[PDB]
Design a protein around this nucleic acid. Structure first.
Ligand SMILES: [Mg+2]
Ligand SMILES: [Zn+2]
Ligand SMILES: [Zn+2]
Ligand SMILES: [Zn+2]
Lengths: 229, 168, 58, 51, 171, 84, 507, 97
RNA sequence: GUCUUGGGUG
């Protein structure tokens, strides 16, 4: 459902690497003292350790990430490619948030884990390619944004948000709102003559161009031939 | 200019004589179909107004539009004035005087009574409310269609009509 | 393509052209149901009646 | 004249007098009447025997 | 005869009029435009039932001109004659070659050849009128007259009747 | 019959590029025909720029009727569609 | 508004319903029967009534009006006549379908060879499309050789003559099927039978594929022209219609006297050939209707097809007013969405600007300036459409501009114009630019836009189109403007980049 | 003369979605014309006398259901040539089915 | 003012 000018190549970070690297990037542990959040980044560091009613949410996050990993590796991208054109550049959003909210001095972050997890969960349920309360509408809406949700969850992970990007609450809310608005701006408009646009986008490159290739092969393809060269 | 729900009437290859008007023989024209429609396309029975229903409707409409003109604040020679244009006032004056020179039912009450009693083809239905007739003869000869329906009831309906007819 | 043959076949079979296409609206010199012409622009009364009473038709 | 179709065209041309070398070249020109109806690139090709 | 009629009138409105009291201006324009007109396909538009309560709906802007189009549909009352329909009247004019009788919004004229021959004209009577043994078609008489002809002229139509048939004429 | 109630309107709440272009053109043409202007005209005299000012302030009194492929349509006032 | 007032409502075409013209309706819509061949009256004024230049057909002259409608050439549409034929003839564009119907039907009593009894045809009837239904009925009904009980012929085509071989029962006596005999057979097909083969009762009746009366187009469709100030040759269609009339009259000179059966066929076939080549002069395996200059006649079909035909040459694309063209030049000092427009072009082209209470001073200064000075104006349009040319108007000082009036001022700075280079391979070959008026005769382009246009400055030329209303101005500036086309959907990357000297210099 | 706004230019305008500009190029910058059609038969056989305000399609014997259409002059010429080859292009201003 | 032919330009 996206306009073809609005998407940019982006890496899906849950796809590549070994399982150990994935686990180290994404898994947080609350009871285990060492493999938890680094204490020197958050105000509430001492309050975190040992909790359970939060380790449940951490496990839910990690299991959703593993579901995305399995889905992308076995159904969508079986050969490992992870750099694909997608709407909304998240690298640029994160760095713009850092610039705007001045994320230096590695200050204690006031951004709690449950709020991060629920913010990303709520965001994933706010990207509307199709509007309607129907049931096939809901199915098509979730099928529409599955890859983009995989991207948004591979980037806005709890460990990544807290350690790698060191966002506070304001930068976090800004990232969510900007993703909302820029995704709503990446959608194709009703009335587009996408057929004429597609015809021109295919025909123009033909003006600049023992397997048959180029113009004769394109001619065989479009003039569907019963035998080929 | 003046159009209505009657639209295409597109051309079939066979043409037809049915456009010939003859009111003795229930031929009126392709504008008064036995089942009308409204401006919402819904089906609706044909209307054929007698002088009584028409007089009530026109009096009501004129006084309503006068009340609309006054902000919310009696005679046909005055009541026809509500229109716009000299030709309009003249036409409506002649129509209202025509109505008040032949309105045997000079109230809404008896019009309602005849509405209940009557409700049969609206042509003759209205013409009975418009044409005083003594016995079966005048009706069945001036309106020749009451013969081939075998539901006449003209005797008693006309009796009660002329009974309810106010003096003059 | 095949303009004359297609028109002859349309005549011989009484084709009805709906005129919902682009080229058909082009050759008749009408606004195509495309892009800016894929919708209609009404005159809004609900927003209009908010105007000052001296801006009225006379 | 009545067989203008099926006759070779352009066998005679208006002499080009724009400049002197254009005239000298027009007087030494040659024409293969293949025609443009046909995409055979072979007769359009510079050949070894052209030397 | 009076017929209730569903009818429409397409209209065009200039942008200069695009104000806060638009709908009532269109209502007045409609009332002025339609109240009195004749059409050969409908009859005569004397009045309109519930005139102030016509719905103008939502108008459409014509692409290229900027004027709004309205399909203001409403149900009105129309009066149309039909050849072979009996219509009452009152005489208006008198003449040796016949007389005029006002029917509905019109005036009907009957010719000399189409009149019972017991009727005799008089240029010298006071009042001048047609007369017979025990009858007088004076001015202001009633006439139950049949229509045997109606020509359709776009603005005003005229019907010439005949009182030559039984149960018809002076009453 | 073909109108849709304001509750089950399932098209985009955002003004598209084509709707914006046509709305601005129509408003500019209207204002150039001495139509009344809803905004306060401060400096600019070009009807297109006045129309843009009206569009930004949600003061264009027009309606977009969005036809669906089945013939039905939805009506949206310009002031309730969202402008980017 | 440049059309005189008509009282009819203005509507748009929602449905096109093709059909054949029925001989009844052809006679009905006509205004004059055409029978006299000769073009002039007698080498004199006011031409022969009932000829191909009947004034009833309409006016193609500037100082004469149409005798059918009372309008001058600026407004008269033209009116059709008719020309009854001595014998019926085939429509050249329907012979294959005439042959197909002949194979399908019973050629004596007018009935389908097979009924709904046979379930194959009983299910072939069930196709909604007339053409698919006709194909499904022809692929079955064409082989049964009996109905009444009369056997069926094997129809065949040899040129324009439809042969039908009757194999009686040995020697199959093969006879020629004339258009009139097929017409008689075809009139007998019943409406439901007609429906089954895929025709229509109201719009397309199978016998209308046989011509019995021929429409004569108005002179607008076949106008004359002027050679040297005193000379005129008729259009090809006119000479073709004259030849058809001669053939018709020669036919009417054979059934009135001696005719030893080898002239009736010949002259009727002359009529058939003239009628065929009046419509289609590209018939395989026969000579072409020729001109005495040796060229073939420009038939109607040849008028309608091709790159230069009506459809592709006059309807899908056409020549337009208010455009300009000249060589392009590069200008480092222009903005990306600016184009430099020569002064002479800025004065030749114009924009009609409605006078309002915000532009009356500027427009009255333009009116005073005149059409030979920039910024000026060329025309003043009054509130009813009357033009006031400001060239020949000697008194340009005595014009007061009314509100609602229109001034056709010059092209000025910041006007949006569509700018274009051929070939237009993609949507970024046509872009909207703001005008900047300049000395010298070339257009000016910022150098970063030469990539989407694929242009350079060694001879190239580009076209400029001026929008003539506020709606088209707004469309250009809000959809086609150069800044809006920087990113392309073809490869979701930019199309304009820093180029040539700025790239080398920035490195 | 004027410049040709050919087929590929139309493709580019269509890609841009500029419908009004395309209609204005092909009509008001070129052979725009006004014709009357019969509301019953849909043929351009209507006899219009504009100064006498009287219209008639003789074939249909019609004088009241007639409409005006603005179409390219080349389209009127195309329909007249089609009529010359016995085809009826019937232009209808409302959809039935 | 029209049709063909020829030489060219991007
Ligand atoms: Mg170049
Ligand atoms: Zn004429
Ligand atoms: Zn048979
Ligand atoms: Zn007609």
């Amino acid at each position: 459902g996206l306009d073809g000018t609005q998407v940019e190549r982006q890496t899906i970070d849950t796809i590549p690497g070994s399982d150990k690297a994935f686990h180290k990037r994404y898994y947080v542990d609350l009871m285990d003292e060492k493999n938890s959040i680094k204490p020197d980044v958050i105000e509430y560091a001492a309050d975190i350790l040992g909790d359970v009613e939060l380790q449940k949410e951490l496990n839910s996050e990690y299991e959703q990430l593993v579901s995305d990993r399995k889905f992308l590796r076995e159904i969508v991208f079986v050969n490992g490619d992870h750099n694909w054109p997608l709407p909304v550049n998240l690298r640029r959003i994160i760095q713009n948030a850092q610039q705007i909210f001045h994320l230096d001095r590695a200050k204690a972050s006031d951004l709690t884990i449950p709020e991060i997890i629920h913010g990303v969960r709520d965001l994933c349920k706010k990207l509307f390619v199709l509007r309607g309360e129907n049931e096939l509408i809901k199915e098509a809406q979730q099928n529409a944004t599955s890859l983009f949700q995989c991207l948004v969850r591979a980037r806005l992970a709890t460990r990544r948000i807290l350690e790698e990007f060191r966002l506070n609450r304001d930068a976090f809310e800004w990232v969510l709102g900007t993703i909302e608005a820029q995704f709503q701006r990446s959608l194709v408009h009703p009335g587009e003559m996408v057929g004429v646009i597609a015809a021109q986008s295919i025909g123009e490159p033909a003006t600049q161009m023992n397997v048959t290739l180029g113009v004769p092969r394109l001619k065989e393809i479009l003039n569907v031939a019963k035998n080929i060269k | 200019v003046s159009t209505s729900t009657v639209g295409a009437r597109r051309r079939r290859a066979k043409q037809q004589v049915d456009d010939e008007e003859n009111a003795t023989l229930l031929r009126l024209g392709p504008e008064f179909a036995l089942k009308q429609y409204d401006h919402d396309g819904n089906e609706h029975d044909l209307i054929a107004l007698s002088l009584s229903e028409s007089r009530l409707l026109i009096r009501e409409a004129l006084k309503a539009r006068s009340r609309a003109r006054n902000g919310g604040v009696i005679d046909d020679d005055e009541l026809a004035k509500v229109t716009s244009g000299a030709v309009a006032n003249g036409v409506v004056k002649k129509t209202l005087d025509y109505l008040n020179t032949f309105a045997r039912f000079k109230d809404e009450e008896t019009c309602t009574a005849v509405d209940q009693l009557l409700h049969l083809h609206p042509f003759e239905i209205a013409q009975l409310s418009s044409l005083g007739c003594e016995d079966v003869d005048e009706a069945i000869t001036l309106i020749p269609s009451l013969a081939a329906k075998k539901e006449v009831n003209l005797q008693r309906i006309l009796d009660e009509l002329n009974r309810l007819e106010d003096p003059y | 393509e095949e303009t004359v043959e297609i028109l002859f076949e349309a005549g011989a079979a009484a084709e009805l052209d709906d005129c919902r296409g682009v080229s058909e609206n082009v050759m008749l010199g009408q606004l195509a149901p495309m892009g800016t012409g894929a919708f209609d622009v009404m005159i809004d009364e609900k927003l209009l009646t908010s105007l000052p009473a001296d801006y009225a038709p006379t | 004249q009545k067989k203008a179709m099926s006759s070779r065209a352009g066998v005679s041309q208006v002499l080009n007098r724009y400049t002197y070398s254009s005239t000298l070249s027009h007087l030494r020109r040659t024409n293969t009447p293949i025609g443009r109806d046909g995409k055979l690139a072979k007769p359009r090709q510079l050949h070894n025997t052209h030397w | 005869m009076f017929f209730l009629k569903d009818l429409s009138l397409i209209l065009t409105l200039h942008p200069s009029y695009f104000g806060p009291q638009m709908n009532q201006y269109l209502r007045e324009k409609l009332l002025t435009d339609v109240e009195g007109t004749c059409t050969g396909q409908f009859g005569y538009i004397v009045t309109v039932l519930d005139g102030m309560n016509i719905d103008v709906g939502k108008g459409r802007i014509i692409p290229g001109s900027g004027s709004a189009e309205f399909e203001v549909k409403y149900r009105a009352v129309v009066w149309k004659p039909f050849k072979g329909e009996v219509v009452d009247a009152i005489v208006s004019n008198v003449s040796p070659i016949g007389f005029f009788a006002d029917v509905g919004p019109l005036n009907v004229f009957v010719s000399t050849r189409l009149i019972p021959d017991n009727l005799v004209y008089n240029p010298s009577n006071s009042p001048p009128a047609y007369m017979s043994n025990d009858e007088l078609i004076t001015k202001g008489s009633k006439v139950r007259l049949k229509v045997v002809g109606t020509r359709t002229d776009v603005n005003e139509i005229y019907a010439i009747g005949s009182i030559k048939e039984d149960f018809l004429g002076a009453i | 019959e073909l109108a849709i109630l304001k509750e089950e309107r399932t098209t985009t709440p955002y003004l598209t590029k084509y709707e914006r272009a046509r709305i601005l053109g129509t408003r500019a043409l209207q204002i150039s025909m001495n139509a009344p202007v809803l905004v306060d005209i401060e400096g600019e005299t070009d009807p297109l720029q006045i129309a843009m000012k009206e569009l930004s302030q949600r003061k264009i009194p027009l309606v977009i009727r969005r036809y669906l492929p089945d013939g039905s349509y939805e009506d949206w006032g310009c002031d309730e569609l969202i402008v980017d | 508004s440049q059309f005189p007032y008509s009282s009819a409502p203005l509507r748009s075409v929602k449905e096109v319903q093709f059909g054949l013209l029925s001989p009844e309706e052809i006679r009905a819509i006509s205004v004059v029967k055409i029978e006299y061949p000769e073009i002039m009256d007698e080498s004199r004024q006011r031409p022969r009534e009932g000829g191909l230049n009947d004034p009833k057909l309409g006016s193609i002259d500037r100082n004469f009006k149409c005798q059918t409608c009372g309008e001058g050439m600026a407004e008269c549409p033209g009116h059709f006549g008719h020309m009854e034929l001595a014998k019926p003839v085939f429509h050249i564009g329907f012979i294959p379908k005439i042959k197909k119907v002949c194979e399908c039907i019973c050629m004596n009593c007018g009935k389908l060879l097979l009924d709904e009894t046979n379930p194959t045809m009983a299910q072939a009837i069930r196709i909604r499309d007339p053409k698919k239904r006709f194909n499904a009925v022809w692929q079955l009904c064409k082989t049964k050789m009996v109905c009444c009980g009369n056997t069926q012929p094997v129809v065949r085509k040899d040129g324009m003559k439809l042969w039908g071989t009757w194999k009686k029962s040995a020697q199959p006596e093969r006879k020629l099927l004339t258009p009139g005999e097929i017409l008689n057979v075809f009139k007998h097909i019943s409406p439901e039978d007609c429906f089954r083969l895929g025709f229509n009762e109201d719009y397309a009746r199978p016998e209308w594929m046989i011509i019995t009366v021929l429409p004569v187009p108005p002179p607008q469709v076949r106008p004359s022209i002027a050679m040297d100030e005193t000379t005129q040759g008729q259009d090809d269609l006119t000479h073709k219609l004259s030849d058809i009339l001669k053939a018709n009259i020669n036919v009417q000179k054979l059934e009135m006297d001696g005719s030893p059966q080898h002239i009736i066929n010949e002259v009727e076939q002359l009529l058939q050939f003239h009628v065929a080549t009046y419509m289609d002069n590209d018939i395989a395996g026969q000579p072409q209707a020729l001109q005495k200059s040796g060229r073939p006649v420009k038939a109607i079909r040849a008028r309608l097809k091709g790159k230069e035909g009506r459809l592709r040459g006059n309807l899908m694309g056409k020549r337009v007013d208010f455009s300009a063209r000249t060589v392009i030049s590069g200008d480092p000092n222009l903005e990306l969405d600016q184009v430099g427009v020569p002064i002479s072009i800025a004065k030749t082209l114009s924009y009609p600007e409605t006078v309002t209470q915000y532009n009356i001073h500027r427009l009255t200064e333009y009116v005073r300036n005149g059409p030979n000075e920039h910024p000026g104006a060329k025309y003043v349009i009054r509130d009813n459409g009357d033009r006031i040319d400001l060239r020949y108007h000697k008194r340009a000082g005595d014009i007061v501009l009314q509100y609602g009036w229109k001034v056709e001022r010059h092209l000025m700075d910041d006007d949006p114009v569509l700018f274009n280079r051929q070939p237009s391979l993609h949507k970024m070959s046509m872009m909207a630019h703001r005008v900047k008026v300049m000395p010298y005769s070339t257009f000016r382009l910022n150098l970063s836009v030469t990539s989407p246009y694929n242009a350079d400055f060694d001879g190239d030329e580009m076209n400029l189109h001026v929008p003539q209303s506020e709606e088209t101005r707004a469309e250009l500036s809000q959809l086609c403007a150069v800044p809006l086309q920087i990113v392309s959907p073809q490869s979701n990357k930019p199309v304009m980049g820093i180029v040539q000297d700025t790239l080398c210099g920035v490195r | 003369g004027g410049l040709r706004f050919g087929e590929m230019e139309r493709d580019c305008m269509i890609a841009h979605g500029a419908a009004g500009f395309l209609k204005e190029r092909l009509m008001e910058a070129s052979d725009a014309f006004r014709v009357h059609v019969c509301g019953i038969c849909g043929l351009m056989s209507v006899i219009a006398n504009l100064k006498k305000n009287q219209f008639e399609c003789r074939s249909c014997k019609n004088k009241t259901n007639i409409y005006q259409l603005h179409i390219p002059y080349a389209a009127k010429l195309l329909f007249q040539e089609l009529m010359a080859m016995n085809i009826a292009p019937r232009l209808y201003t409302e959809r039935s089915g």
